[PDB]
Amino acid sequence: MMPIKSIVTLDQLEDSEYLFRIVSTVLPHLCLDYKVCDQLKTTFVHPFDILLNNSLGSVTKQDELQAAISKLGINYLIDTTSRELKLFNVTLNAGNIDIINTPINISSETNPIINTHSFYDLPPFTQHLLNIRLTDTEYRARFIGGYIKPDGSDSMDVLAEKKYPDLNFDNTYLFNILYKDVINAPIKEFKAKIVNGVLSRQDFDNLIGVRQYITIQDRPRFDDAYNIADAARHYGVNLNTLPLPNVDLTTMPTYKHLIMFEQYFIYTYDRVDIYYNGNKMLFDDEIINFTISMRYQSLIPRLVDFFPDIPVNNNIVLHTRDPQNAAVNVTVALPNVQFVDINRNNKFFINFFNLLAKEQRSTAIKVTKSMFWDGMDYEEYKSKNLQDMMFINSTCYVFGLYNHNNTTYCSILSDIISAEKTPIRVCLLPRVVGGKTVTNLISETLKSISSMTIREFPRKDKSIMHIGLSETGFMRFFQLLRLMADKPHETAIKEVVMAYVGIKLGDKGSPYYIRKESYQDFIYLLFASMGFKVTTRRSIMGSNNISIISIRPRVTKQYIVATLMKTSCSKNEAEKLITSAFDLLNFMVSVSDFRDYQS
Amino acid sequence: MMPIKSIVTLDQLEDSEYLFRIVSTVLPHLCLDYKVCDQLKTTFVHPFDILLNNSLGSVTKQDELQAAISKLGINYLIDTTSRELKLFNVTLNAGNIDIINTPINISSETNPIINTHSFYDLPPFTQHLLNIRLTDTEYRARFIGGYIKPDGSDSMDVLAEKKYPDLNFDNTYLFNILYKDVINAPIKEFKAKIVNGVLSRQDFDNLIGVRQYITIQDRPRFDDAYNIADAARHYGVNLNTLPLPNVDLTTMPTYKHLIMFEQYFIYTYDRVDIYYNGNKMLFDDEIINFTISMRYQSLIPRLVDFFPDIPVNNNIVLHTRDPQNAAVNVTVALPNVQFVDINRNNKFFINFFNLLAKEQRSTAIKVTKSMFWDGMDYEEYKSKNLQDMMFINSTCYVFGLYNHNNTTYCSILSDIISAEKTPIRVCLLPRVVGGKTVTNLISETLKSISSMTIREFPRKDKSIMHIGLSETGFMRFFQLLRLMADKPHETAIKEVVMAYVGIKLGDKGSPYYIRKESYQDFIYLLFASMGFKVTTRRSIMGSNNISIISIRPRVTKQYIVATLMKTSCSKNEAEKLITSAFDLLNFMVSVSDFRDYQS
Amino acid sequence: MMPIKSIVTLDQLEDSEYLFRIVSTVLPHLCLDYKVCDQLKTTFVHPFDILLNNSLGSVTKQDELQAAISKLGINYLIDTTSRELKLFNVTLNAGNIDIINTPINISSETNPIINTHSFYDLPPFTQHLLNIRLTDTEYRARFIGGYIKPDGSDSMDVLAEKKYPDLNFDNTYLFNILYKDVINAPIKEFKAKIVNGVLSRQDFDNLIGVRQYITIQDRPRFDDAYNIADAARHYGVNLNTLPLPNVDLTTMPTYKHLIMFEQYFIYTYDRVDIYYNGNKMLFDDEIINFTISMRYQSLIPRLVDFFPDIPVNNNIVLHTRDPQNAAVNVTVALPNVQFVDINRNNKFFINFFNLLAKEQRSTAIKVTKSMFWDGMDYEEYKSKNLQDMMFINSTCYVFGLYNHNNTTYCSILSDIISAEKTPIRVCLLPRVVGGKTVTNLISETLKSISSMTIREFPRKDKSIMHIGLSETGFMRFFQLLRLMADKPHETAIKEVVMAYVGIKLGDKGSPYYIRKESYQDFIYLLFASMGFKVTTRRSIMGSNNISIISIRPRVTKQYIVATLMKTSCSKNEAEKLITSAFDLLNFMVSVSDFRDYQS
């Protein structure tokens, strides 16, 4: 009468050993002809977690992951320079990320449905995003999640009060920001790389080029913030032989360095005077409007696909100061040249003009339908077989999308329903158990059992020290058993045998051998987990002592095969399960009459 | 063998669909002659949540809500200007509220009982207040909660180390602070309103009048902080034609504007010189003492009801500077005029003198006993029928009040008890489920069933596509069913039928019709939830295919009425429940022999 | 049919009444010959909680507690002055502690295992440390927890990237920092004490002595920060008669005050010029290196036991400025005098040199193996009887220690296992229930039952108003019963009777007497909790009314003794349990035929 059985408690519902119970509660209700969606096999793990803990690359597809990395870096830059909306709750550094403990901000614009669920089993970043998604506007969650529209009409029409533009491009910006060996620069938008302890040559060249646009008053701040003199010496660069600066817009060969100065550096640093035809530029807004319009002329016709209500013209007026400091009205117009007025939203737009330039230079990012962002049409969700629906309602967090106040919100689907509103679309977020997805653990187990070769139960024999598992595998199986309960033997065996298989399908190590001294502990635990009673008795043989482990009912072929047939979708599937478990069954049956002789 | 049944998991205990289970677990144990307390029908939702999310006005009474709004605005002002105690953990803005992620502060003065419960099912604001209430002094919770004493002796004698005065007054201060169309002023105590994008005329007039007491050194700060020149132009006010300032205390027609300057504006702005009889006031404390004593003379006798140990006299000495800058000792005394010394606690008291002036001008706020703040005498709690007690111990969070270290603390009653201390009073906090209170959902269901008209079960017929519910109602009932378990049919039917009624009592829409293609899914779910087995079989009729949904036991009159009589308080109540459910029973019985013919 | 039974809900799993259920779920599975480890009887409560809430001194040993207090104060000082690692998440004040809501910081160095568990039942400080321990490096947790190595080889070899030195010393630093009556000084490392409202004389003398090393430019900052002029007047000290300062290193009688200035005060204050042989010291680093090397010469040979890679030499070069402001190269060497170069890590090392001086002056701190920090060798954990293991897997949080990336991490053991890694050591953290440990409640109950004297059941009699419990004891027992369930009578009685005993073993008060008016409520609850059915009926006797409480099966000797024998490890233990419960059984049996007569 040992305390193997328990009391429902909160810690016992949170430890990851209890998430494996999902795999073991859902898998038994699926038939081998059950199909798992290809788009659900892997899940969403926010990339902020993946790039810090890359062991989780095991739960995402690598193409999808790189796509997400690209897009988040882009969105991060957009939100970082944006002021009208503040959608990210994360500050990125140098091998590390800070989840900001922002005040809980409740407003006039939040989701009317109260979010009660914590998302406790997901990485820190995924818990954070889901708690945002279920509190605020769906638009916000998609943006933060690093969401790329699928190439098609089967998607959500997202509503909001304020929007950021729909840019979709393949880059490695997030990776570069988080690369551990970076400088934690005053600028949050970009982190220059470090090589051999100093500014990398590739980023150094850009910093020294950028330096042509900063003022002698602040150069020391720049140089000390980045340690440019020392990196220059380290890589053989003479920082004092830089070519004369190009600060005049009518001859300036390259505009790109002034643009970067203005987007990133000017936030903490002041700027060098810029001239137009020898005449000092008077307005900051206009050096920006002119510089980006001339550099990105070919992209002006593309602004309207994201910013349809942005003024565009063929006549830009710059204001400058001549040598006598007179104000000068300068009108610039060229055949076929458009100019754009930014409406003083300077950092936000500089970033976009330059992002589109990269869109034009590098390739498009292409993705499949994201089950966790765009999801399914609600009619498709509703039209869905109950077996298929109930799988997703357990293995995935299930969320709707609905309209209210000309805005769309995401929330746990059951809460949209209790709040009496009708969903438009349904999204799924598969869970992660021990570094593997719940859907992949279930899918692989179904695939490997159905693809398996059949035979007979292992026979009873002598000296069986292995349970076909490794020291690691043993311990995984055995500790999971503690979560057992008294219920039909029939249910417990199917769950135990499937767990046994699920472990072998991932455990590729050598068998670990069991010791006579604890042989009986292993027996007690595995048999008890299947509903068999195990007791200990002692017998005297001459002067010898026999420790008898008595199991009732005993485990032999007729017990496992009869019970699996009773609870299987078909008798043939019961045969496929016992063969996949053959390596594990051998111990289960051969120790069923175990006796430990002390001599 | 689909995964309809589940595993206790944490998310399944948090989603709001699981709170409806309280309604469905408690309601079945109450008799129709059970009474629900009028003071429990509605609950406490902290007003900070109600005014941001007004859909929750559905769970409070409107008179109580306005009373709470008035008092919180008052308490907010008191705590905002207070320095001796910091009781609020919330910063209020412009259509939004920030719950401050303050450090968890544990001291020498906290509740000795460890608070283990999170309050996960309540709005952000209510979770926050309850977590404060269970950590710190009860006094603190009452203050933050916006608590007005009931007019009577049946109340708590609250103990603390430090106290704020007992002011009870009807105003709309909290509403005004949170009104979305306000200016996020440098001052946290008050937010001026915005009309047509500029300072409202009503608040503008006060700001321009206030401006007479600010210094030319800081006027630009004031004008820019509020955009007074532009609001003035917008509404036709000439900001530069303001009457000469009244800065001398012996002739100053109105004291009110200097008082506001000093209470609110002076925090971020400096002040203009103030004189007494032509002689510059030397001490800030004295311009305050004199100004408020003369303006609020009629309220001095009322200070002692809140501040019994505050010096009051008939001789005030002011210190001033004459034209030669000599210090002057000025004694002021008038027949029947009292003066009060503030003890340098200037912002705190200015607020009180002016709050009492409003108390004198506008009406008193009157409330009934607050079940969630003052609660019941512990003897009344103990004396309470077990049926009544067990209702509140499920539907409400239940808290005691007890003495320790000459302080009173609130905590979950069971923790006061496990900590071995004796409660003085017991407070109740009814839960919110889907925007409705748990107590109202239970009370309304009992009232409408007991007030209902009786009849017979609906008869079996043809083409029944409705389940007497709406698309929304369907989905609510059907998804709740997933939480079903194997238990006597007798229990499951009573719970299902009552849930059916509880939904119809709120669902006022048209019936939604069911489609032959999913007809069987609806059948599987509703019958399974009542403990009936549902299986699918196919029959061949000539060349046609019949999909047979077979239910065992079948649902017809004798099954539901026999089971409800077995578990009802009386056979007559079983009849009242089936009639209230007639519209829902029709589908349940008529599809009991459902066959889907494919032709 | 009252709502005594319930629904698993989240709040019902969190309230402390549910932790007592652990005591009542584990205790019944232990035999009276079961032994509880002496090192588990008491637990770890982080001292930051104990010193704010000293009611929890009930769950720690006093020697262990003082040891922990000493070490935390030391570690706090080390981490406070350290910059290379930031291990504490707590800021200490004046009778209070702030748990810092730091950003969740995830990096490249965190535990690869996802921590899903919250630790919800522990004090704020213990929850915080366990959440750190399970996220970051084990080294970090040991440091923050205030961990002293046991005197032996049976310990963990902890790995990390960066380390703090292994100092183990007996002091009262944490107590002094948190003493309520302290000044909240600008310096976080030390808080001077307050006596009679002013700086204490003992700390005042040190502050006025420290003042000899601060600059006339900042003296007013110092004096105002501490109110030294007023404390001086209060205790009769003339602050202006202080002896001339000793600012020159070749004659300076005591080095100790310059060292303190430099370690603590210089952080917010500037410093007075220091000279070497009449020649002004030019480098801050060198006044430090020289001052600490000369003062702590005897400790230099001990640095290497903690800092093995720290340069030590017999020739130190100081740089000074002569009267003509020439730079002077001063070489100092003495027979048998070592000098140490600090490598500019000045505040960190000054603290260590002075901590070792205290190590040399005061005694060593000696502790036993800490079960919660160093734990057991994983082989000892594995080798452990299942009864013993399953006890700790319920009553304690169970954690492993494992290697990854040349670092060691701690995590919930089951998560190390599901993550497929092998533990090195296992640590246990016993839970706290109502101010008592779970292991002590279980151990004491086993000890007092096994040490008890046997007899017979109490006999039925008249006027039994007590249940052998106090008003407090009643309420504890009775409310715990609400957590009851339908299960064999046999299990329920053993749990109820043991809970009854566990309460009497702590409840030393007088019996409280039950009132005829609620006599039946107490009966309903205690019998229902043991699986007995209780119903109410009325009988008419002439004109009188009898309220009949009918219990079936009835509770008399044969019911309790037969059921306890069935579920006991031995029939003799069943007898020991009924005698320990005699005082409680009397009511249970004597009211079994209770009738309330209304006359």
Numbering used by the authors:
A (entry chain C), B (entry chain B), C (entry chain A): 1 to 599
Task: Show passages lifted from the paper.
Poxviruses are among the largest double-stranded DNA viruses, with members such as variola virus, monkeypox virus and the vaccination strain vaccinia virus (VACV). The core is one of the uniting factors in all the infectious poxvirus forms and fulfills one of the key roles in the virus lifecycle, that is the protected transfer of the viral genome and required accessory proteins to a newly infected cell. Room-temperature and cryo-electron microscopy (cryo-EM) analysis of VACV has revealed the presence of a regular, but discontinuous, palisade layer formed of spike-like assemblies on the outside of a continuous viral inner core wall. Here we show, using a multi-modal cryo-electron microscopy (cryo-EM) approach in combination with AlphaFold molecular modeling, that trimers formed by the cleavage product of VACV protein A10 are the key component of the palisade layer.
Our analysis revealed that hydrophobic interactions dominate within the 2,104-Å2 buried surface area per protomer pair. There are also several conserved inter-chain salt bridges tethering central alpha helices together within the trimer. Remarkably, each pair of protomers assembles a core heterodimeric three-stranded beta-sheet (residues 85–110), formed by two strands from one monomer and one strand from the neighboring monomer. A hydrogen bond network on the outward surface of the beta-sheet further reinforces this interaction, while the opposite side of the beta-sheet packs tightly with underlying hydrophobic side chains. When analyzing our A10 model, we found two highly conserved cysteine residues (C31 and C569) in close proximity to each other, which conceivably could clamp the N-terminal and C-terminal domains of A10 monomer together, stabilizing its conformation. The model of our trimer fits into our STA density map with high agreement, leaving no major area of density within the palisade layer unoccupied. This strongly suggests that the A10 trimer is the main constituent of the palisade layer. However, our fit into the STA map also revealed that the lateral interactions across trimers within the palisade layer are not extensive, given the wide spacing between them. Interestingly, the bottom of the A10 trimer facing the inner core wall is strongly positively charged.
